Design a protein around this ligand. Structure first.
Ligand SMILES: *[C@@H]1O[C@H](CO)[C@@H](O[C@@H]2O[C@H](CO)[C@@H](O)[C@H](O)[C@H]2NC(C)=O)[C@H](O)[C@H]1NC(C)=O
Ligand SMILES: *[C@@H]1O[C@H](CO)[C@@H](O[C@@H]2O[C@H](CO)[C@@H](O)[C@H](O)[C@H]2NC(C)=O)[C@H](O)[C@H]1NC(C)=O
Ligand SMILES: *[C@@H]1O[C@H](CO)[C@@H](O[C@@H]2O[C@H](CO)[C@@H](O)[C@H](O)[C@H]2NC(C)=O)[C@H](O)[C@H]1NC(C)=O
Ligand code: NAG
Ligand code: NAG
Ligand code: NAG
Ligand code: NAG
Ligand code: NAG
Lengths: 171, 323, 323, 171, 323, 171
């Protein structure tokens, strides 16, 4: 576990409908939710792959399970039953535990993705903004919609605003 | 002042899943891995219909018990189906030898043609092919017998040595069944076959068995103190089968030229048969899925999901739903 | 100046566990997943005691070998137990037909009552039920025989055709055993049964077999050059069984009305039997677990942990112990 | 692995006996160990669940493994043996590897819990204290027992002390 | 200004692996977990060579079909090998009883010595051991017979009761095979054995069987309308075997004193046999590996990797290769 | 996933040939790649152990799989086939998925090792250097080869250089 989901970002956003992970801004021009489509898509592809891996790796052959034995063949009847029952116990246990294990991992995978995305942003801004926590960053400068969209697509210009931020930071 | 927050999705959803660390965890999206629904119908497996015996069992069917002629016999089938009231079988009591192996071998065939190996009118000029009928196998209220066998009995006061061969020119193997009759008493033996102390002999290239009647009173079954045992063999292409007898032989009339398929099975259920395709059949009904597990029934036929004891196998795709 | 440090537990413990990346890792707490202890006792499985044959085997026991009468036969049992000195069986040499199937069918019963189907005093007025004893089955030093069977021999110089029926009015199935005797020589044949060339015939609604003695010298076993084969069938409720014979029949005396249970088994060990319940039994002793694995024995009876080859399966609960 | 246990916090505390993860303070009023009971309990519940998952998912049916064959039934005897032996090989391998995998994960789980707890504290204090490392925080103000108990239960008042700390920080 | 960067390896490599989340991922180093290579040779299993029958099958081999004497029989072997042209078997047609169980019991032996239990020159002074040959089992162009059996026929116009015992003084069990002959016609019966209506009886301490000829015309096989059934038993050390006959017995000549090993098997392939060691043998060839999985063949003999349907099981050791 | 490999350190070094994880320095005395041998070795040992765990836990017994049945034993022939085929399906699935799971984990394991190593260094230097990102640290003082080798083996003296760095930092 990575400490983000249900953690230092304590809740989810029902209002963010266009993806799994994203942002919510607020400047003079307005405010709103917007998914990060690259990292959301990236995850969908990988989860999809997981689901398909679990399903499509199963080798299925044609077989007629049932057998019929006469009243003087109890022993091979019971041999047969042992086989059917042995396979039932194996598949049941593996299937049950596979799912339990993969679900722990899937959930953690998402936690990781959200954490990596917080860090991605933190390391762009640095001291040009304050880490409130709960996943928010509070700017020391005027961040207009172009500025926002730049952080979201990873092309934020630290230099541009670094001096405007410094003077504001001290008060 | 301006802010930018990082966060994650939440929604409507009430889907839960289990993990190793935690149960009943609510998630945004989820997918099911366990098929638990079946269509309540016995369908056509890989496009080809099963053989539905209904009133009879396999024994009754292949012998031609009189109650089974209202069935119509297809020329191929994917699996066999009996019902729990499939009680019409060997109407004259006795032992059906290697019966279970017979049912396994007929479970699926890609080709099946019934044909008159020893035509009634022409094959038995020195024996009586018309008498030889019993209250144990009644037809239209009157005494009858199996359709695919003839019970040869003496002509006048004479049962001369009987001798008959069949060469398999059918290019597939042919299943030949016959029977042998064990009378109640030496009086009965002599009534039917004239000579007491008889033998029947049957042979192919790989089979050879001599049979002697065992004359005694058994407990009455369908009013018979006598008995009749049913035998069968598969004559391979090119090979022949020969019968030799001084009495007590229930000779074949019809035989079956067949091509066996490959381990299918017989399902016993009263679930109705329908026109539908499937790749996986259970006695409760058919399964339409690509999910790797199922909990409907352990005894399946086809390319089936693995039967498990689980009630729920739900796999998280989305994330923890927190609002 | 004031401080606040973050940290974790450490302790006494020397429990180690293994991981994929690292062996012999010491941890604070840990739990074991492999049952390796058994109680050294054969216990009552699902609350019902096993049948303990001790000196005899199943063959000796149901036939009534003279050494087995000091046993007491319960009216139900969960599984059967023989010891490695269970050597008292068929004292008169021969073949016990379908014996292994018989032992499987008796392995568990919910109801078992022995009873005199053909009472000694009343059933055989024209044959000698008192002679018919042998040095192969000795009782109190003197020549004896099985308890549940009578070896009928001629009376005076006469073995008239024997004929006897039993109708099963018990409302459960009844297991009937009999035997057939193959003398050494025609002199012995005639000594016992007067007529050389005899037959025995036995029949129910579903069973019918004729038997002829095969008179010849076999290699001596327990001083016998002759032989005796033992047969058995199950008569269903309402059905009857009939015997017919001109000699060589070892006729039943006791039979058993039973209700079969469902696949249990027979355990062969000298481990002592005790009063204790269990849900999992091995020949070495019983297992009291909720753990999913065990390494005690592969051959178990009950709801058992899965047998594995592991010596240690220890699951970490706590954390890495670092001091 | 999360780098905390046997890592940047290089040792464990035999002296902390009331739980798995916790704190050790030192102020003018005294000093001592004290477990974090919320996070310790949380972990116990989850590990317990893991143990019970591994045990209780095992489907066991009534079966009598042993069979007895006569001397002309060698072939089905050997068939039976192949079955028994095949099941042994499967269960042994799965059981052995299940445990190996789950132990790696359990240990990592604790590492994560300890790391998350360090981070929880760090993000409350911020510059009101110095990160010595080895998991310690060295305050720039007077932190009395009420103050301590406030950081431990997550209700620490940054404002209260922020000025007392700033002046002390500059030496 | 001075800098210090932290980073990771990259290389030449094009090894890919799959993960749950992602396919076709290129990694620096990687190791294979699936053996897919075999040496195309049938080798010696655990140092000891198989028995290679080549032209014959086991039936032909232990009976001593004339085409199998150019084989040389070792005194121990690990497993047996037949080819797809191993068609020399029972040259005189009939049934080989419990043949499959016989092949399984001979599949591996640690000791095997052929020896003349009933020497030809001395054992049969009142019967003709020299006539008793057939066009079905031709030797050097001329009519012949099995090597390990003698077909005893009458001497002059007389087949007196035959009676012969062998006591096993070999300290291992000895396998004894014999045959019984069913003529085409009573003329043939009488030509060979004088008396029509004969019997053969064979017995040990645990075995006892009577045999009667079944005289009739079968479909011609290798020009024979008669038939000959082959039987076998294992005489335990100290026990004896006895033969008694008024005709129709094909008596043993050679027998085999053996020590059985433990479930090995028979492999049927034309893959050549070589001097080679292995711990795992398939019909395609041998496998030299310590990897846990293989996809070469499902039917193996030895300590083998588990057969899987995978084409590739590659395990990452190094890391993601990013340049 | 830990966000380092193929992440905030966006590429690998073909030039670093003596190990899996390491450093690249640059001072007045020269520059070059050098593996961290302690952490590289540590990983090799653990990965090796994983490989051997997967291989050497397989219990293999002597067995002859093949059986032969006569033409009236179809049912036990098919039983036998059901057994062979059932085992095939089980092993195939487990093997396929075992590998898929263990590979995801092995890759993540390396990610973690690289991240932990970055953090190890960051927490030694602190403000004596600047976090450029892409895994680089840009010193505010003269770091000679002895200084470098001290950071690499974890014995870096913060005090020594802390003042030389402070004055240089303010531009
Ligand atoms: C077909 O089966 C039916 C019923 O399964 C037979 O009719 C029964 O016959 C029994 C025994 O002779 C009687 O006790 C009953 O009067 C009948 N029962 C029912 C339910 O009808 C019938 O004889 C069978 N016919 C053949 C030719 O096999
Ligand atoms: C019950 O078994 C005992 C022993 O298992 C049999 O007596 C043995 O007989 C052998 C050979 O006949 C002797 O050499 C041994 O000395 C005997 N052993 C013992 C312990 O007495 C006995 O025949 C069996 N009794 C019955 C009625 O079957
Ligand atoms: C040994 O086997 C060969 C073939 O594998 C038999 O030879 C065949 O004999 C038949 C008639 O019996 C001929 O029609 C064929 O021409 C032969 N086939 C071949 C390939 O040559 C031979 O009879 C067998 N001999 C014995 C003694 O078993
Ligand atoms: C980036 C990379 O590794 N590419 C290779 C490439 O040679 C090949 O075309 C591809 C097909 O899926 O598999 C792999
Ligand atoms: C089943 O599939 C076959 C494919 O050849 C097709 O001919 C047939 O019409 C199908 N039947 C139904 C009812 O869908
Ligand atoms: C075993 O089980 C039965 C019935 O379920 C019960 O009456 C009895 O007390 C138990 N016996 C012992 C010895 O615990
Ligand atoms: C949830 O609400 C949405 C929108 O209001 C609606 O479309 C959907 O049918 C609802 N389903 C559930 C999960 O109740
Ligand atoms: C096979 O190995 C055995 C012992 O390992 C040895 O005696 C023999 O020479 C080897 N034969 C081969 C591999 O040719």
């Amino acid at each position: 576990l990575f400490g983000a989901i249900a953690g230092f970002i304590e809740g989810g956003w029902t209002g963010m409908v266009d993806g799994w992970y994203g942002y919510h801004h607020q400047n003079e021009q307005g405010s709103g939710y917007a998914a990060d489509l690259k990292s959301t898509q990236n995850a969908i592809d990988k989860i999809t792959n997981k689901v398909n891996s679990v399903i499509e790796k199963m080798n299925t052959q044609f077989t007629a399970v049932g057998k019929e034995f006469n009243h003087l063949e109890k022993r091979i009847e019971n041999l047969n039953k042992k086989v059917d029952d042995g396979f039932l116990d194996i598949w049941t246990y593996n299937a049950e535990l596979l799912v339990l294990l993969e679900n722990e991992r899937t959930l953690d995978y998402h936690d990781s993705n959200v954490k990596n995305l917080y860090e991605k942003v933190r390391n762009q801004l640095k001291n040009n903004a304050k880490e409130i926590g709960n996943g928010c960053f509070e700017f020391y400068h005027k961040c207009d919609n172009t500025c926002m969209e730049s952080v979201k697509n990873g092309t934020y210009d630290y230099p541009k605003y670094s001096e405007e931020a410094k003077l504001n930071r001290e008060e | 002042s301006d802010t930018l927050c990082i966060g994650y999705h939440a929604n409507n959803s009430t889907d839960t899943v289990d993990t190793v660390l935690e149960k009943n965890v609510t998630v945004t999206h989820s997918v099911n891995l366990l098929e638990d629904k079946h269509n309540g119908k016995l369908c056509k497996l890989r496009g080809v219909a099963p053989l539905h015996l209904g009133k009879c069992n396999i024994a009754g069917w292949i012998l031609g018990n009189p109650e089974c002629e209202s069935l119509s016999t297809a020329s191929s089938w994917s699996y066999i189906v009996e019902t729990s009231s499939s009680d019409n079988g060997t109407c004259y009591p006795g032992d059906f030898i290697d019966y279970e192996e017979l049912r396994e071998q007929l479970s699926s065939v890609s080709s099946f043609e019934r044909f008159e190996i020893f035509p009634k009118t022409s094959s038995w000029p020195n024996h009586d092919s018309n008498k030889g009928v019993t209250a144990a196998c009644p037809h239209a209220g009157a005494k009858g017998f199996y359709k695919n066998l003839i019970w040869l009995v003496k002509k006048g006061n004479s049962y001369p040595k009987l001798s008959k061969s069949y060469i398999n020119d059918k290019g597939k193997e042919v299943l030949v069944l016959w029977g042998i009759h064990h009378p109640s008493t030496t009086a009965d033996q002599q009534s039917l076959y004239q000579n007491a102390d008889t033998y029947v002999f049957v042979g192919t290239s790989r089979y050879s068995k001599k049979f002697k009647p065992e004359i005694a009173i058994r407990p009455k079954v369908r009013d018979q103190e006598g008995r009749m045992n049913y035998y069968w063999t598969l004559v391979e292409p090119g090979d022949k089968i020969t019968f030799e007898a001084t009495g007590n032989l229930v000779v074949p009339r019809y035989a079956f030229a067949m091509e066996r398929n490959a381990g299918s099975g017989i399902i016993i259920s009263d679930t109705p048969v329908h026109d539908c395709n499937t790749t996986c059949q259970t006695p409760k009904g058919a399964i339409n899925t690509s999910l790797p597990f199922q909990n409907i029934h352990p005894i399946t036929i086809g390319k089936c999901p693995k039967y498990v004891k689980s009630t729920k196998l739900r796999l998280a795709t989305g994330l923890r739903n927190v609002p």
